[PDB]
Amino acid sequence: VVIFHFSWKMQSDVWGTISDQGVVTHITGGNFAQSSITINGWLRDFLWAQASQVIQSYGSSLSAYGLFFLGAHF
Amino acid sequence: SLETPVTSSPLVAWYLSNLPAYRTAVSPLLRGIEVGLAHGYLLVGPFALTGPLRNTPVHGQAGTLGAIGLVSILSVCLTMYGVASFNEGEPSTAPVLTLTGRKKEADKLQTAEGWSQFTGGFFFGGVSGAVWAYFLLYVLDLPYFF
Amino acid sequence: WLSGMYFHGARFSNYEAWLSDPTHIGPSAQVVWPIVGQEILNGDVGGGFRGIQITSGFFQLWRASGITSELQLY
Amino acid sequence: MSHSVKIYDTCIGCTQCVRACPTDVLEMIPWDGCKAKQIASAPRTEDCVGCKRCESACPTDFLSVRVYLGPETTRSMALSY
Amino acid sequence: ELRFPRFSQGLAQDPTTRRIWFGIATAHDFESHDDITEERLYQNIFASHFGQLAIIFLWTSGNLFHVAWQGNFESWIQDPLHVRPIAHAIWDPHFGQPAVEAFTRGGAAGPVNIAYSGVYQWWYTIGLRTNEDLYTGALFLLFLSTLSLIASWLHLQPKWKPSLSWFKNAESRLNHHLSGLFGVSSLAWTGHLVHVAIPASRGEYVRWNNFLDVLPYPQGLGPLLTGQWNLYAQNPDSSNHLFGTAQGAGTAILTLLGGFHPQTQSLWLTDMAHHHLAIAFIFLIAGHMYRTNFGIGHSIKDLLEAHTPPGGRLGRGHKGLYDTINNSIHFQLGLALASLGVITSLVAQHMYSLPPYAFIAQDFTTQAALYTHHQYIAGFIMTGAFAHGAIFFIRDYNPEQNEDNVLARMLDHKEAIISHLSWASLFLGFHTLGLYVHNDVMLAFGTPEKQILIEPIFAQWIQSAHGKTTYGFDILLSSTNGPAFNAGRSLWLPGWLNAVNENSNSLFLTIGPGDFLVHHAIALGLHTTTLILVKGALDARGSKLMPDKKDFGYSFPCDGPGRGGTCDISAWDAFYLAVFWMLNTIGWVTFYWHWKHITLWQGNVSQFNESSTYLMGWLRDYLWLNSSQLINGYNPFGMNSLSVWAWMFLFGHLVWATGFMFLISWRGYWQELIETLAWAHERTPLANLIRWRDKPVALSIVQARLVGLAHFSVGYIFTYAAFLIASTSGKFG
Amino acid sequence: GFVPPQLDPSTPSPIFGGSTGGLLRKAQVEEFYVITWTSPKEQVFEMPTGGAAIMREGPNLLKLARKEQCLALGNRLRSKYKIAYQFYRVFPNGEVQYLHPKDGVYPEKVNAGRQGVGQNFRSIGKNVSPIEVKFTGKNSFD
Amino acid sequence: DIAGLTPCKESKAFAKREKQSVKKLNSSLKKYAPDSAPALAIQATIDKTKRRFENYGKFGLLCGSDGLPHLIVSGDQRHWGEFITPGVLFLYIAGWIGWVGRSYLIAVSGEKKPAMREIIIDVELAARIIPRGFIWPVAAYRELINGDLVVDDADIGY
Ligand code: CLA
Ligand SMILES: CC1=C(/C=C/C(C)=C/C=C/C(C)=C/C=C/C=C(C)/C=C/C=C(C)/C=C/C2=C(C)CCCC2(C)C)C(C)(C)CCC1
Ligand SMILES: CC1=C(/C=C/C(C)=C\C=C\C(C)=C\C=C\C=C(C)/C=C/C=C(C)/C=C/C2=C(C)CCCC2(C)C)C(C)(C)CCC1
Ligand code: SF4
Ligand code: SF4
Ligand code: SF4
């Protein structure tokens, strides 16, 4: 739970990109303070959503990270 | 057994001996009604201020009636525990020895009929305390914050 | 273990290209043998290199200590 | 009588149970059915707690002392409160 | 007894709290009670059956009444394809305004949820039309329930207590059941099909008032007396038919077509009428075999005696089975549970193939719910079967009364059976997992062609024989030379072929490799669960680890930690360890069915066939995507109709997890913790005045296992049920 | 049986601060136990329910909740310092009962005079199946 | 053409899969020097998967409606280069291993404590027992003929 919290807080309030003018658009859009307060949120906003890149990972460089995602479960 | 300053001290034993649940020199019904009015004045606060109708001008009566209902439920529970554990002619199970060793008369509070008087007193006292907290919170209500 | 790490940095990394400009060049320090179709593992990491991307974070250290040459790793 | 102990004539009178009985249940008595001329006995099954350590020792064919379970009580349950 | 419970004196002397616990589990049980005899046991069984029937009848009466008081049946008739059903009105004092908003659906005046149990199609197919009908039915059912309870009381007083002989009279009972309970019942159901149902579907309102004059046929009751029975199949309804009225409807009341009604996309009424009229006479004749009081018929004992293969390859054979069955209830219960589980599985497997009720194959949600329901129930009953079989071995099997008979002949080589079951399990498991992992890897690299993909050729040929043509095998019933096809072309084959060759329907789905792999996984689950249960049954008397287990009763904690450790060795523990695999296999089956149908309804079975052969395909296309409508049930931007399910969904993924707390952490830990808590509460002021009555003690070991399994099952059912309903309610397709 | 009890007297207790391993409501309502032994010299020993304390010279007197703890401490005292001991049971009426030796000689070895409570003179395999004895009070091991 | 499955020597979706694969590979190829060893290995894998597609288009592989091979294990030896011959080959290998292990164990049974040779193999005896695999069909055969393969009522102990 500690590491999940860390990942979400960083990707929702610190990490991200900065525009040419200086506007910040964080990697996840800054929905922590409004979607970390519901377990259903944790499913929807963080656990389900940010699990995309591992699950479409077949047929790419990252495909190894995909395979483990099953054996790990197994 | 261990005897730390907490479990053994003049002031702590004094305080615990002065509250109604142990002053055997009073009728059990009166101790019951005293603890009842105590808890009645107690519980009204959060139940009213943070209830599900706090943003409504009825929140006072709402919280107070809810407190009264909880008091009634707990009085039911008290009577039920008493009729469950206390038989109607059998002796008492109260501590009859003090710290020095004075053999104490069996506390009538720890009897079936005594527990019944206690329950009735507690219920009446809780009702009175709740209505008193209401009348002091919504009529004469300047020096408080709510 | 440390020796293996420094070796694989020396003989199998793109460390010099990474030092050239570390802004948008992915640290890679592991290539895989092209035998059983796992060539896809050697994905695009930039800088004219192919290799499994790493996240150990050695490269920031090797740039702090001014290694800046494969002879030193060797 | 809460639990129950049984002993069978495959007892070789080796006396490991008694040495391992935690709450002084078993003992030995003079018999004629082994070299040691002694067989087990359980006249104190009240305090029989129920741990199988006794029959976890009997090094016989299958067993020679069985611990059959039954109802419960205040002392057969290791209660201390 | 001097205190609860009144049925076991040994418990009443337990000042520990587990008393109350075991004062619940061992109530219905009858052997273990104190001072119980045979005939008393039987009379108790009778009273309990009456009570159960009372409960069932009150349940169905409540169903009917609730629909009749808040449902939609009446105005549902007018458009069974554009007005959702209704279950019952909501009255929830915990709602907020948007909740009340998102629940008033389907055309009601308040928050209501959608009835998914398929009761509307049932009560509409027989031909009911008005709320008054439902009121009358509810009153009748309620009175019947009260009557059954009256019987449950009456048969437990003298002047009505049945002696054990009356219970032991198995031949008369069986002849009665196979004759009356089955035959006359089927005939009466055909009666209700041919006196109300069919004319109602043809738009004639007949009820308990006008059925004296209306004939089920213009000149019926006399064509069969004439003997030329074909007059009952002359004019059937046309294939351009309005199920509500008599447009294109004929006058035949008994047909044989084999096709699906076009409008209702279901079976004609006449088909069920004819089938039931047949089965009625079948059962009625069958129920005249066993000698009861007239010297004619058969003695079942004679039958079980006269069977002994020459050369004694079975030994004494079936000699003595009659008594060792008629003397123990548990054997009869094991048989009953087995057969009932099988037929429940059958009902599940057919109710999606040949939609019985009109306008049911459209409310896809209802089909999926019913199928999953019946399948899980069948699984549970099947487990209970082997459970009670092992109980029969533990408690009632006699050695000498069964010397050398087939029963005692089983036990002699239990090792071979267990070994071969384990071999089948190992084979299926190894290869089904190998193929999956191979396909998974070979796609992970981007080479979908290097995968292994077997063709379900056996099942394809079977389908071809049944009449499927897209495989082009041109075998029986697909070729015009075979005697069967050429003898069928005038009886049923037109409509049967019109159905099976059609694709938009649900019968005879096309099948590729993924279906082969899933069927193999299902066979794995079947064989391994069978292994668990049969090991629990045969090894119940005792193995070399504990040869005298048969003296410890059925469920015991263990036989000590020594001599290698003996945790989880009771046969109860075997049933325990089997329930897990039962849930797993049924989950697999329902996964397969639900994905197949949820692809077929959207017309993209291609996606299934492509990406159902690699597990990641299942985790991506089936779970991830199809759950996206659910997990957004309620968000910080509001809620939806799906809210409940989402909520309930999470509920599952919680209760399930709690089960683990009981399957891992065993007692002694919690025992010491309770010790500490007891000392704490004891030495605390203002609370030491309040004493306890039952010394707090952590639960027993088998009690732990039980409650942990209950939690597991509850979570694993709630989760999947809510997901299954929501995924097809958010889309209806 | 010339094996009389000793009628446990009231002799001093070991030096110990008193701790959370003592008696509870149970001991004050149902029953408790007292173990008694004579000691050779003031030494240190770990009590069953926590920590360690010292004994005195002459006879000792320790109270405890359940018999198992008393007998565990007694076996420790017999295997560590080679001293004999007894332990008694008490009831709130005022009764005192003498439990462990029952003759003075350990139950570890033979001492004629003990009866034969609970023997079956047949190997374990000879037990019968519950069906032969169902619907009765009897059980297979009886 | 079993149930209509055309061989992808003639189907089209196979060609589409091949085209898309080589296309994404080639598009990836043009991000390096045309002579860099990684680019060289990329082109090598390109031609390798190409000749794989070719080989598959040479051995009667009936081929799905989605552009994928699909085995035909129905028993017809026409499509036997998938199950029958590899099946009997693996059966030969498995019989080899089973027989050699069984023979080793039966041999080493006759010692003081055979466990010491079951943990630490008699690599000399192992080497002079191992190559006997060529006998596993016939030898065991005679065993069953002479009934020296199974036992009747000896269960425990040995
Ligand atoms: C050569 C030795 C040998 C032989 C002839 C057999 C033969 C058999 N085993 Mg088996 N087994 C073995 C070793 C062997 N086993 C070992 C080492 C293990 C432990 C991993 C098992 C575990 C095992 C189980 C769990 C089961 C069998 C079963 C069976 C039977 C059916 C075949 C099967 O399912 O196997 C499946 C294949 C395996 C389990 C693989 C094991 C084979 C190993 C890897 C070979 C070992 C060779 C040796 C150690 C290496 C030394 C080489 C040499 C130089 C000395 C069959 C009689 C089944 C049965 O009871 O059937 C009725 C069954 O359920 N076996
Ligand atoms: C434990 C035990 C028990 C139990 C057991 C069981 C539970 C069993 C089960 C069993 C089972 C579960 C079985 C099953 C079976 C099945 C079957 C037997 C099937 C058959 C089928 C058929 C025969 C079919 C045919 C056909 C076809 C193929 C198709 C077409 C049509 C026809 C019909 C031709 C008891 C109690 C007794 C006691 C003893 C022990
Ligand atoms: C990340 C991590 C790690 C590690 C890991 C590892 C090292 C491993 C893993 C592993 C895994 C997670 C695995 C999984 C798996 C799964 C599965 C599922 C498997 C399977 C297999 C199979 C299936 C096989 C088969 C076969 C073969 C191939 C051979 C023999 C024959 C057969 C056929 C049987 C670390 C520590 C660094 C850190 C922490 C975390
Ligand atoms: S149960 Fe076994 S071990 Fe525990 S006391 Fe009685 S005999 Fe000794
Ligand atoms: S059982 Fe083992 S230990 Fe107990 S008496 Fe017989 S032999 Fe000695
Ligand atoms: S876990 Fe239950 S069974 Fe296994 S050893 Fe401890 S007690 Fe005996």
UniProtKB/TrEMBL annotation, chain A:
The gene is psaA. Chlorophyll a' binds at H73. It comes from the Eukaryota. PsaA and PsaB bind P700, the primary electron donor of photosystem I (PSI), as well as the electron acceptors A0, A1 and FX. PSI is a plastocyanin-ferredoxin oxidoreductase, converting photonic excitation into a charge separation, which transfers an electron from the donor P700 chlorophyll pair to the spectroscopically characterized acceptors A0, A1, FX, FA and FB in turn. Oxidized P700 is reduced on the lumenal side of the thylakoid membrane by plastocyanin. This is Photosystem I P700 chlorophyll a apoprotein A1. It comes from Hordeum vulgare subsp. spontaneum (Wild barley). Belongs to the PsaA/PsaB family. It is found in: Membrane; Plastid, Chloroplast thylakoid membrane. The PsaA/B heterodimer binds the P700 chlorophyll special pair and subsequent electron acceptors. PSI consists of a core antenna complex that captures photons, and an electron transfer chain that converts photonic excitation into a charge separation. The eukaryotic PSI reaction center is composed of at least 11 subunits.
Automatic annotation (TrEMBL), chain C:
Chlorophyll a 3 binds at Q30, T55, S56. Chlorophyll a 4 binds at W33, Q38. It is found in: Membrane; Plastid, Chloroplast thylakoid membrane. Belongs to the PsaA/PsaB family. The PsaA/B heterodimer binds the P700 chlorophyll special pair and subsequent electron acceptors. PSI consists of a core antenna complex that captures photons, and an electron transfer chain that converts photonic excitation into a charge separation. The eukaryotic PSI reaction center is composed of at least 11 subunits. PsaA and PsaB bind P700, the primary electron donor of photosystem I (PSI), as well as the electron acceptors A0, A1 and FX. PSI is a plastocyanin-ferredoxin oxidoreductase, converting photonic excitation into a charge separation, which transfers an electron from the donor P700 chlorophyll pair to the spectroscopically characterized acceptors A0, A1, FX, FA and FB in turn. Oxidized P700 is reduced on the lumenal side of the thylakoid membrane by plastocyanin. This is Photosystem I P700 chlorophyll a apoprotein A1. It comes from Hordeum vulgare subsp. spontaneum. The lineage of its organism: Eukaryota, Viridiplantae, Streptophyta, Embryophyta, Tracheophyta. The chain holds residues 84 to 157 of 750 of the full protein.
From TrEMBL, chain E:
Phylloquinone binds at W670. Chlorophyll a 8 binds at N175, T292. The chain crosses the membrane at residues 134-156, 177-198, 329-348, 376-395, 416-437, 516-538, 574-595, 644-664, 706-726. Chlorophyll a 10 binds at H275, H350. Chlorophyll a 9 binds at R207, W208. Chlorophyll a 5 binds at W122, W189. It is found in: Membrane; Plastid, Chloroplast thylakoid membrane. This is Photosystem I P700 chlorophyll a apoprotein A2. Chlorophyll a 6 binds at W166. Chlorophyll a 1 binds at H88, W91, D92, H94. It comes from Hordeum vulgare subsp. spontaneum. Belongs to the PsaA/PsaB family. The keyword Nucleotide-binding does not apply. Chlorophyll a 11 binds at F458, A459. Chlorophyll a 3 binds at Y116, S117. Keywords: 4Fe-4S, Chlorophyll, Chloroplast, Chromophore, Electron transport, Iron, Iron-sulfur, Magnesium, Membrane, Metal-binding, Oxidoreductase, Photosynthesis, Photosystem I, Plastid, Thylakoid, Transmembrane, Transmembrane helix, Transport. Its main location: membrane. It catalyses: reduced [plastocyanin] + hnu + oxidized [2Fe-2S]-[ferredoxin] = oxidized [plastocyanin] + reduced [2Fe-2S]-[ferredoxin]. InterPro entries: PSI_PsaA/B, PSI_PsaA/B_CS, PSI_PsaA/B_sf, PSI_PsaB. Its EC number is 1.97.1.12. [4Fe-4S] cluster binds at C558, C567. The keyword Signal does not apply.
